[PDB]
Design a binder for this molecule. Structure first.
Ligand SMILES: [Mn+2]
Ligand SMILES: [Mn+2]
Ligand SMILES: [Mn+2]
Ligand SMILES: [Mn+2]
Length: 999
């Protein structure tokens, strides 16, 4: 009977007919769901003078107050004759119109209608409300209409928790050589993971009958599977069902038309759903049909795309029913920087745990994980994935099937089909079930269909595991709140669009409108500035300091905004440059104005100087100031809340404010954007770069002796003269006996790395904490602060992208387990051989000791270690004492997509008693005839790849083709060195080739 008036908004969505509306989907405290319909309007902002003129009057209008409208067009000046920026004030009107309308000079045109709805009616997209039933009339069951949302939604109330419904799905399609085409290839499996409002999980997979033998189908039935002849006969409590492809497809249609809250896939929008839909249209006549919650609009499922050059394309479903069809692949690309976006990689990273060993031998290891073994509930997370996972990865390398599993709420005991090297502990990774599908389909029988079924249900459940892991639900709500957007639009729309809501709110609060009355000239701030460490290998510890949100703070410091730009003053020669500078300093003095040297915009200009008035806070800095404040709030709320549901909400809010803040720098240089300002963007780049150089200049050559830190330069504010004590000799609270010396070793857009002549990590942390304090209190100024993140022992670094170190964090002490940090790399188990590993490990240990002598050029180390390499290499090529075991490499056999490796294994099988079967792990080496001398040409090495089995003995008339292994080894060694010209000389002489340098 009676509707519950207490609702929590969870999505908003539009119909698009000639007769169009806005719809809300909300959830009551009980679990009932209320859809509410609102009439659509198109909003326009006009001046009072325009309002009064309007041909027929607008449907409705609310005044906005007086508002300053400002010309933000950017102009360069060749002298200091800079005209004031055009500014007018007028009473403004927000007008509502049911049909689109062209208004000759309407302002605020960039902002979205949906944003105006929320702002105007005073409605938060994710809020909870006690609806005033007085303003709702019913129209279907469950669906009401609201002509007056302002009054209906007048009583906002605190957040209550709600349950939600999910369908996670994945499908498998047949193929042999080409990528599956809908016209010829059938769907073989469809797997579903349904989460009910109760929390109950339902797993079911439909297998396509038509790809099995009548005898096999009956075997499946005999074994436990349900066979069905139509949609009508489907029992959803059966985990395995056999049916025709047409039935399977009809079942998909029925599920996809249901009003789940979320339908979640990994690349389902471009593949899985597209395929189901087209295949259905082919085999029967049928479409998949979504309907608005009042049944007024129906649409056929049609996947559409959205484009965004900086770059990628994303795919979206057009359902008008309130369901959020959400693709994890698209999302994980937008919101994470990763080397792989394959699902096995993303899962490997997300789901790992530490495994203590209980049994050994046979071909079966056994592990346990729990709170004792890794962290609190890291094993709980792993154990949830194990419910459906069938292959675990041991120690980054060993893929190996599960044989049995015991799962409880906090830990897992798992037994695995692998080799044996049993230490007390090992790392366990998850992800897919790895297979060769192409072969599975070629040989397809019942036991393979069931295998694929288990593989497929897991890829679906990975979507629910990753959805929990990335906190998508709460991020969606936080997004919707902060961006002033429907939940469904939060990760669909691009960054230039999501910033517009909070910008609009700011412009309204500051009674300001920004108008670009001109075509923007073309140029962004592209430059491609990438940063090279002073040396690669570090004997000493390295201290890591991060600026705090540098670019947000730079904009705040300089008050960088299109409308606070007084002007830009350019010069083509030094006379103009000097005259202009001396006039600049007279007419626009600090501290009210800041003047910023930028890279000049034209090639004939020798200087470009942007001048900003700091007296009246600019739009952009204030936007950022809000975002940092809001983030700060939520970080506190995060620590004061204790319910893990609440922790998640506040953690998301906090994240959302980080992201939107960091979007701003980019948006200032993106031409199609509401925050575009070439000068501001360039000035921001430039001020930040200067802050890096200032910090570096002060620390590079700095020493701590007695109680005093002797900064290497005076602590002068780099932009203008300052109240602060520039004295670089500074009292510290460290021990008098301490004597240390600092070197600026690397620095980038926001981070600075400082070598200290010391290996004692406990002291290094003591000192770095003091450095932090003095940098923040004496070196820096205004809103510029650094954190001391960590100490880096045994840094070996090529760039910020490729580096390896042990990391003692700021919490850390001398004797807690570091964090091994590897980045960018490609090797381990048979990618590289034991000869190589042993040689790299020695040449590192010899080289780190060489840097602790202090006696070196770049060259005296470089000459010394390359003499050593020749001597060891020529020695092994002569003596040949090293076993073949040291030169063996491994590889998995599999079918094509690789091509010469099938020829390698085929011919081995075709010529030898043993067979290397199609998922076996086989060994090989680079072997050549003994009568080949030191070779500096090269061929396709693939000819000297030689399968080494148990009965292989090295010919009396063969040798290990040492050159292959040597060339690879000295490549890795010269990339540790610093003298480049000496290394290239060596490598052309020894190998007749020019080396790689990871740049
Ligand atoms: Mn898939
Ligand atoms: Mn799959
Ligand atoms: Mn930090
Ligand atoms: Mn066989």
């Amino acid at each position: 009977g009676a509707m519950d008036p207490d609702v929590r908004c969870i999505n908003w969505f539009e119909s698009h007919g000639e007769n169009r509306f806005l719809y809300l989907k909300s959830r009551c405290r009980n679990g009932e769901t209320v859809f509410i319909r609102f009439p659509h309007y198109f909003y326009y902002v006009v001046t009072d003078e325009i309002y009064q003129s309007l041909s027929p009057p607008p449907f409705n209008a609310r005044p906005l107050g007086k508002m300053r409208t400002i010309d933000i067009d950017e102009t360069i000046s060749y002298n200091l004759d800079i005209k004031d920026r055009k500014c007018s004030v007028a009473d403004m009107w927000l007008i509502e119109e049911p049909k689109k309308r062209s208004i000759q000079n309407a302002t605020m045109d960039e902002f979205l209608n949906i944003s105006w709805f929320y702002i105007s009616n005073g409605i938060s997209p994710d809020g909870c409300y006690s609806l005033d039933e007085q303003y709702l009339t019913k129209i279907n069951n469950g669906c009401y209409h609201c002509d007056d949302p302002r009054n209906c939604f007048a009583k906002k109330i605190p957040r209550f928790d709600i349950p939600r419904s999910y369908l996670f799905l994945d499908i498998e399609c047949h193929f042999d050589k080409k990528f599956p085409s809908v016209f010829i290839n059938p769907i073989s499996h469809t797997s579903y993971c349904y989460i009910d409002l109760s929390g109950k999980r339902l797993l079911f997979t439909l297998i396509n009958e038509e790809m099995l033998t009548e005898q096999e189908i009956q075997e499946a039935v005999d074994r436990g599977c349900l066979r069905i002849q139509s949609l009508m006969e489907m029992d959803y409590e059966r985990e395995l069902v056999l049916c025709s492809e047409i039935v399977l497809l009809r079942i998909a249609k029925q599920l996809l038309e249901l009003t789940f809250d979320y339908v979640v896939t990994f690349n389902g929008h471009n593949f899985d759903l597209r395929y189901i839909t087209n295949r259905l249209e082919l085999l029967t006549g049928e479409k998949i049909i979504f309907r608005s919650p009042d049944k007024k609009e129906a649409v056929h499922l049609c996947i559409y795309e959205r484009n965004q050059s900086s770059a990628n394309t994303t795919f979206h479903v057009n359902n008008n029913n309130g369901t959020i069809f959400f693709d994890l692949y698209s999302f994980i690309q937008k919101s994470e920087k990763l080397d792989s976006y394959k699902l096995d990689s993303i899962s490997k990273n997300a789901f790992s745990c530490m495994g203590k060993v209980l049994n050994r031998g046979v071909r079966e290891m056994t592990f346990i994980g729990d709170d004792t073994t890794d962290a609190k509930g890291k094993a709980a997370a792993f154990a949830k994935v194990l419910t459906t996972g069938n292959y675990v990865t041991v120690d980054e390398d060993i893929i190996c099937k599960v044989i049995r599993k015991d799962i409880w709420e906090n830990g897992f005991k798992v037994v695995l089909l692998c080799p044996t090297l049993p230490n007390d502990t090992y790392k366990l990774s998850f992800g897919k079930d790895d297979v060769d599908l192409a072969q599975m389909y070629k040989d397809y029988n019942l036991n393979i269909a069931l295998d694929m079924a288990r593989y497929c249900i897991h890829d679906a459940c990975l979507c629910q595991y990753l959805w929990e892991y990335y906190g998508v639900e709460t991020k969606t709500d936080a997004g919707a709140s902060t961006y002033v957007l429907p939940q469904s639009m939060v990760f669909e729309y691009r960054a230039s669009t999501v910033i517009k809501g909070p910008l609009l709110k700011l412009l309204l609060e500051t009674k300001t409108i920004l108008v670009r009355s001109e075509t923007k000239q073309k140029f962004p701030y592209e430059g491609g500035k990438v940063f090279a460490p002073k040396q690669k290998m570090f004997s000493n510890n390295v201290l890591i300091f991060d600026y705090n949100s540098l670019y947000p703070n730079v904009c705040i410091f300089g008050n960088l905004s299109p409308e606070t730009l007084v002007g830009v003053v350019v010069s083509t020669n030094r006379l103009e440059e000097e005259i202009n500078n001396q006039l600049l300093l007279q007419k626009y003095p600090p501290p009210r104005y800041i003047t910023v040297h930028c890279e000049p915009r034209l090639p004939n200009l020798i200087s470009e100087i942007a001048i900003f008035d700091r007296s009246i806070e600019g739009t952009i800095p204030r936007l950022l100031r809000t975002f940092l404040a809001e983030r700060a709030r939520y970080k506190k709320m995060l620590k004061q809340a204790t319910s893990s549901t609440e922790k998640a909400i506040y953690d998301s809010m906090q994240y959302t404010y980080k992201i939107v803040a960091n979007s701003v720098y980019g948006l200032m240089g993106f031409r199609n954007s509401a925050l575009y300002s070439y000068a501001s963007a360039k000035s921001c780049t430039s001020i930040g770069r200067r802050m890096i150089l200032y910090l570096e200049s002060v620390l590079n050559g700095a020493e701590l002796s007695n109680g005093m830190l002797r900064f290497a330069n005076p602590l002068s504010n780099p932009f203008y003269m300052d109240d602060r004590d520039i004295n670089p000799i500074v009292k510290t609270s460290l021990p008098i006996d301490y004597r240390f010396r600092f070197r600026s070793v690397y620095g980038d857009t926001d981070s600075v790395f400082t070598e200290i002549d010391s290996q004692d990590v406990d002291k290094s942390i003591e000192i770095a904490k003091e450095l932090e304090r003095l940098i923040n209190n004496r070196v820096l100024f205004n809103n510029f602060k650094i954190e001391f993140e960590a100490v880096y022992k045994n840094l070996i670094m090529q760039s910020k992208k490729k580096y390896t170190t042990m990391k003692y964090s700021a919490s850390s002490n001398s004797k807690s387990v570091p964090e091994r940090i590897n980045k960018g790399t490609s090797e381990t188990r048979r990618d590289v051989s034991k000869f190589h590993k042993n040689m790299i490990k020695t040449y590192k240990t010899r080289l780190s000791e060489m840097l602790s002598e202090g006696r070196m050029n770049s060259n005296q180390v470089c000459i010394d270690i390359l003499r050593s390499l020749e001597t060891d290499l020529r020695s092994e090529f002569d003596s040949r004492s090293s076993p073949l075991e040291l030169f063996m490499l491994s590889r998995m056999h599999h079918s094509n997509y690789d091509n010469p490796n099938m020829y390698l294994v085929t011919e081995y099988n075709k010529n030898n008693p043993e067979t290397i079967e199609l998922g076996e792990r086989y060994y090989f080496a680079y072997i050549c005839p003994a009568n080949v001398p030191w070779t500096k040409k090269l061929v396709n090495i693939k000819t000297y790849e030689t399968i080494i089995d148990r009965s292989f003995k090295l010919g009396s008339d063969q040798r290990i083709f040492y050159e292959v292994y040597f060339k690879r080894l000295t490549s890795e060694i010269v990339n540790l060195l610093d003298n480049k010209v000496l290394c290239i000389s060596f490598f052309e002489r020894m190998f007749g080739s020019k080396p790689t340098f990871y740049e």
